[PDB]
Design a protein around this ligand. Structure first.
Ligand SMILES: O=c1[nH]c(=O)n([C@@H]2O[C@H](COP(=O)(O)O)[C@@H](O)[C@H]2O)cc1F
Ligand SMILES: O=c1[nH]c(=O)n([C@@H]2O[C@H](COP(=O)(O)O)[C@@H](O)[C@H]2O)cc1F
Lengths: 259, 256
């Protein structure tokens, strides 16, 4: 690798994207590189965790299509907490169709994602058309995309030349693409953000192919910026204490990589 | 090559695939309609008017500004009345644990109405396992996306092989594929193909079209998915029959 810059230094890079830069500054302001994967089926419970975990997090990740009681005002209440506790909103929609379709799924329908989500992700299997169709909606609204360069699940096919291609598609769309979902550092340009799912303190998995690694491994050894943690916190008796442990473990793992 | 009625009686066929293959033969249609509309009222009006010409209605429920579960009830009534399957083009593409919840829950409750849904293989077989837990209870099927119609698509080579292997090994839930071509030798598997137009073209955003003759006749696919080719017409029924006959005859000519 080359010489590691800090998040603050990174937020000021000439080729940096506005969304990433906003994120990075808050990562250094609050000493949090923890993304809370808020996997819940009630609007109310998503708002309760956002309000309480907010000070501990640099991002909130949502699957909005798991909410039973989704209304746009629930996203208006969630922007409030995001504006106030300071975190980005990341809708984990994983766009994966052709340009023309993804474009309408991003702007329209019942979810109106592009009107409240700073960040979305897209798979790269369709070719760059997915990104091109997304950028027509997201740019006008000052948004970024993350491109799924690798996956944490067993038997995942995002490896090899697949991964190299996500990275390419990202460079060539730097004006919209702000980084990656991956398991390690996949790009050498520091203007790109790395976010890693499949993270738990203790070694393990689930019964449907999720593989877990630890914050130290993911941030220290592998190069990630940020960790996405779901059940590792959400399941806990004390979700605040859980969030804090993951905060401190990831933060310190980053400090240690820096010098 | 077997016919569509013969395939319906294959020992290893899935109940959904079976129900599908029958009405195709009963109706002489292998046209799936990609109904990409924002207004539910147009959605139903197409389903009603074009029902007899189609074997499947493919939806993007997330693109509908006025989604209610009653729209879906009304749609199910027309599907029962005109005999087509409902395909929610959702493309599940996350991990086992998440897709199960996306498939079963939330606003859309896709499993309560969709005969068929689809999923990307990219995560590995966990995706299918998550879906099959909700799906199997309810007599549902999945199509895997093995190839894609767009420029620079990564669903090629080893990727395509892995979808095939993955379908092979979950044939209790996976009733076939989204692809540009025949990708399986096993006639139990349905092959449905998007990026279908009569005239050679593309759009400005990655889409590449081939023709019903090319797709059903030369490439060995079973069903054609057609969105803009029909919806953009002044007269959607006229266009639908045009695609039906094109596809239907392209199939007979493959049979011998
Ligand atoms: O590769 C991935 N793995 C994932 O787990 N995810 C999401 O992160 C979350 C991780 O949840 P966990 O409970 O921490 O495993 C879950 O919502 C998944 O949909 C996304 C990915 F892109
Ligand atoms: O590889 C694919 N190509 C596609 O075009 N599609 C979808 O089929 C539909 C075909 O649309 P058209 O209007 O006929 O291009 C559309 O809804 C796309 O999302 C799906 C695929 F899986």
């Amino acid at each position: 690798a080359p010489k590691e810059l800090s998040f603050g230094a990174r937020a000021e890079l000439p080729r940096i994207h506005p969304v990433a830069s906003k994120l990075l500054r808050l990562m250094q302001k609050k000493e949090t590189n923890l993304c809370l994967s808020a996997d819940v089926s009630l609007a109310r419970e998503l708002l309760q965790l956002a309000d309480a975990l907010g000070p501990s997090i640099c991002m909130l990740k949502t699957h909005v299509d798991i909410l039973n009681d989704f209304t746009l005002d629930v996203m208006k209440e969630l922007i409030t907490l995001a504006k106030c506790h300071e975190f980005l909103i990341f809708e984990d929609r994983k766009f994966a169709d052709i340009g023309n379709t993804v474009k309408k799924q991003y702007e329209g329908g019942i979810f109106k994602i592009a009107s409240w989500a700073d960040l979305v992700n897209a798979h790269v299997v369709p070719g760059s058309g997915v990104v091109k169709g997304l950028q027509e909606v997201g740019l006008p609204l000052h948004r970024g995309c993350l491109l799924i360069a690798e996956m944490s699940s067993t038997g995942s096919l995002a490896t090899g030349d697949y991964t190299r291609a996500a990275v390419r598609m990202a460079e060539e769309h730097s004006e919209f693409v702000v980084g990656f979902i991956s398991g390690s550092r996949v790009s050498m340009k520091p203007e790109f953000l790395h976010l890693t799912p499949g993270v738990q303190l203790e070694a393990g998995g689930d019964n449907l192919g999720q593989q877990y690694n630890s914050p130290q491994e993911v941030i220290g050894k592998r190069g990630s910026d940020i960790i996405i943690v779901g059940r590792g916190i959400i399941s806990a008796a004390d979700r605040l204490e859980a969030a804090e442990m993951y905060r401190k473990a990831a933060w310190e793992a980053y400090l240690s990589r820096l010098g």
